[PDB]
Amino acid sequence: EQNLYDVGPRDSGGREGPGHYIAISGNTAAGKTTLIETLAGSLRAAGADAVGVSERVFHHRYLKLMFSASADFAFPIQLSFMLERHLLLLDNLVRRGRTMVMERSHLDDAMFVREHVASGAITAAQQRAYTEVSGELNARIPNPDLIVLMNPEPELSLERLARAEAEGSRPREFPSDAAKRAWVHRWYDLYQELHDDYRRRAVDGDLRGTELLELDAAASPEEKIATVTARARSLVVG
Amino acid sequence: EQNLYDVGPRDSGGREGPGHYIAISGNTAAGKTTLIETLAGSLRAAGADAVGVSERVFHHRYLKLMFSASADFAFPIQLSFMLERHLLLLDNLVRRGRTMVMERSHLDDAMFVREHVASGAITAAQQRAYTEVSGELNARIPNPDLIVLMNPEPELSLERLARAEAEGSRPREFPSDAAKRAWVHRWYDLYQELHDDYRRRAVDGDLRGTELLELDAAASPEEKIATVTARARSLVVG
Numbered sequence: 084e085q086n087l088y089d090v091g092p093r094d095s096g097g098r099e100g101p102g103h104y105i106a107i108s109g110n111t112a113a114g115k116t117t118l119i120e121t122l123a124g125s126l127r128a129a130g131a132d133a134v135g136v137s138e139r140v141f142h143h144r145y146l147k148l149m150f151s152a153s154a155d156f157a158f159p160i161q162l163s164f165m166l167e168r169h170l171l172l173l174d175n176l177v178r179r180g181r182t183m184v185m186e187r188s189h190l191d192d193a194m195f196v197r198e199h200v201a202s203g204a205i206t207a208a209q210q211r212a213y214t215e216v217s218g219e220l221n222a223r224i225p226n227p228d229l230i231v232l233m234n235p236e237p238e239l240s241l242e243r244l245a246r247a248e249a250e251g252s253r254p255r256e257f258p259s260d261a262a263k264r265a266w267v268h269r270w271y272d273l274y275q276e277l278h279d280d281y282r283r284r285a286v287d288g289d290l291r292g293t294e295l296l297e298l299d300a301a302a303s304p305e306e307k308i309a310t311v312t313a314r315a316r317s318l319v320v321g
Numbered sequence: 322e323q324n325l326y327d328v329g330p331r332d333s334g335g336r337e338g339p340g341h342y343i344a345i346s347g348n349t350a351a352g353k354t355t356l357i358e359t360l361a362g363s364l365r366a367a368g369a370d371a372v373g374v375s376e377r378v379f380h381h382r383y384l385k386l387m388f389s390a391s392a393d394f395a396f397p398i399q400l401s402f403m404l405e406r407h408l409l410l411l412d413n414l415v416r417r418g419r420t421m422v423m424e425r426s427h428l429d430d431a432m433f434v435r436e437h438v439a440s441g442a443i444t445a446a447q448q449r450a451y452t453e454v455s456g457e458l459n460a461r462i463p464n465p466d467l468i469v470l471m472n473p474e475p476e477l478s479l480e481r482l483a484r485a486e487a488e489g490s491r492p493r494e495f496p497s498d499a500a501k502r503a504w505v506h507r508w509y510d511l512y513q514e515l516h517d518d519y520r521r522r523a524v525d526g527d528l529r530g531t532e533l534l535e536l537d538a539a540a541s542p543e544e545k546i547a548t549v550t551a552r553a554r555s556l557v558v559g
């Protein structure tokens with residue numbers, strides 16, 4: 084539908100350079116997928132060669148082993164998230180000049196490695212190797228142009244996840260109810276810190292030139308799309 | 322058919338530890354796929370929980386961009402080969418104790434990065450990052466137990482490739498006839514060196530305990546399977 088994996092030649096008319104890059108950043112079950120699908124379609128309607136990319140597009144077949152056998156599979160599955168995200172950005176955003184609406188940015192993945200390092204599932208030496216590769220990959224990808232900061236409270240995430248799992252609309256990914264609850268909580272705390280770092284990064288760090296937009300994860304989906312569209316519409320190029 | 326991506330629990334009866342690991346190592350169009358499919362079935366007939374894995378199982382959707390835009394995609398596509406191979410070994414061979422017959426070993430991939438570094442498509446800093454990750458990943462995978470050294474001459478590889486591409490039985494992966502010819506030749510030279518290194522590694526290096534088996538790539542398929550079976554049959558465990 085969106086031609087995400089085309090190895091053919093660029094086709095951007097006379098426009099040069101990468102497309103523009105919108106990232107929706109926050110913990111699981113915030114409403115990001117819902118927002119991304121609508122936003123990508125709205126940008127296409129405005130004339131942009133835009134695509135919306137949820138991580139489920141590139142989830143590894145071995146995903147569940149990261150959560151059931153983390154000291155064995157957290158390191159390579161985290162490498163997978165990084166690498167598959169990178170390749171989609173390198174091709175769609177950079178090579179082909181398309182506009183990207185993505186679940187998370189390439190800057191979010193390092194926080195998920197930090198969680199496994201803190202728990203002991205990934206070693207410090209493994210993290211150092213990850214970071215070396217991450218730095219080389221990230222150097223080839225432009226910063227996001229708009230980061231939407233939408234971090235849900237843990238009990239909100241878990242309420243939404245429990246309903247979806249119970250209705251069969253999403254798979255159960257964790258080895259126990261407690262493992263799901265605990266990862267959601269540890270990720271929430273790390274996301275609060277990551278977003279505070281992003282706020283400083285955009286002023287005094289390497290994200291100068293990037294716009295940040297705060298969004299309450301408890302807002303209605305229609306309020307979320309209205310709020311994000313009011314900033315994303317400015318980024319449309321034909 | 323072979324249940325390669327099962328995230329469920331191990332089921333090896335009373336047998337502990339990894340399965341056994343047979344790798345077929347040599348340049349493209351040697352006859353490895355042909356041999357691997359038959360060998361895996363023969364080992365299953367003998368009572369082993371064996372699988373045969375060709376790289377085409379885990380080829381990235383972006384493979385062709387490694388050869389048409391190498392200074393942009395060689396690094397992440399080489400990371401993909403490494404990582405997807407690693408995950409299949411970590412799950413099937415180690416976690417689940419299955420016996421593996423694989424196209425190449427995890428020790429072969431570094432030579433493909435060396436080719437891109439020599440040409441300039443991968444930078445020295447990119448290669449250093451690759452090697453750091455490669456070392457951490459390889460430390461979790463047992464050495465191959467039997468390495469079959471089967472390196473075809475370049476014109477033999479190219480004859481077989483041209484016939485398959487002409488008949489539509491394999492896709493054209495390269496941006497030109499010359500690019501195909503040149504990569505095949507550079508890989509051939511590097512494989513001659515890699516195999517000489519393996520021969521020394523198995524005596525004075527970290528492959529002590531591993532068996533090597535020489536096989537002429539020009540031999541008939543039935544001679545190849547007879548020759549490899551005569552050594553692989555000894556590795557069967559129930």
Ligand SMILES: Nc1ncnc2c1ncn2[C@@H]1O[C@H](COP(=O)(O)OP(=O)(O)O)[C@@H](O)[C@H]1O
Binds near residue numbers: 118244252
């Ligand atoms: N504002 C909301 N109110 C209630 N449920 C919601 C809301 N947004 C999403 N959900 C539900 O939560 C689950 C996950 O939503 P999703 O958009 O996929 O979140 P995310 O991508 O951030 O992980 C889905 O079942 C979805 O229908």
Ligand SMILES: Nc1ncnc2c1ncn2[C@@H]1O[C@H](COP(=O)(O)OP(=O)(O)O)[C@@H](O)[C@H]1O
Binds near residue numbers: 349355485
């Ligand atoms: N001994 C052989 N003689 C002639 N053609 C062969 C022989 N072995 C393989 N081929 C052909 O060469 C092509 C590639 O063979 P394949 O087994 O897939 O090689 P590899 O896995 O080493 O790359 C196939 O079209 C195959 O039919």
Ligand SMILES: Nc1ccn([C@@H]2O[C@H](CO)[C@@H](O)[C@H]2O)c(=O)n1
Binds near residue numbers: 195
């Ligand atoms: N680099 C990343 C990105 C995401 N995730 C987690 O993967 C799960 C997908 O349902 C979600 O629980 C999400 O939090 C992850 O573990 N590591």
Ligand SMILES: Nc1ccn([C@@H]2O[C@H](CO)[C@@H](O)[C@H]2O)c(=O)n1
Binds near residue numbers: 399402403429433494
């Ligand atoms: N780590 C690796 C392993 C394999 N290859 C090449 O991929 C092609 C697959 O048809 C073959 O040409 C094969 O040589 C590769 O480029 N890099």
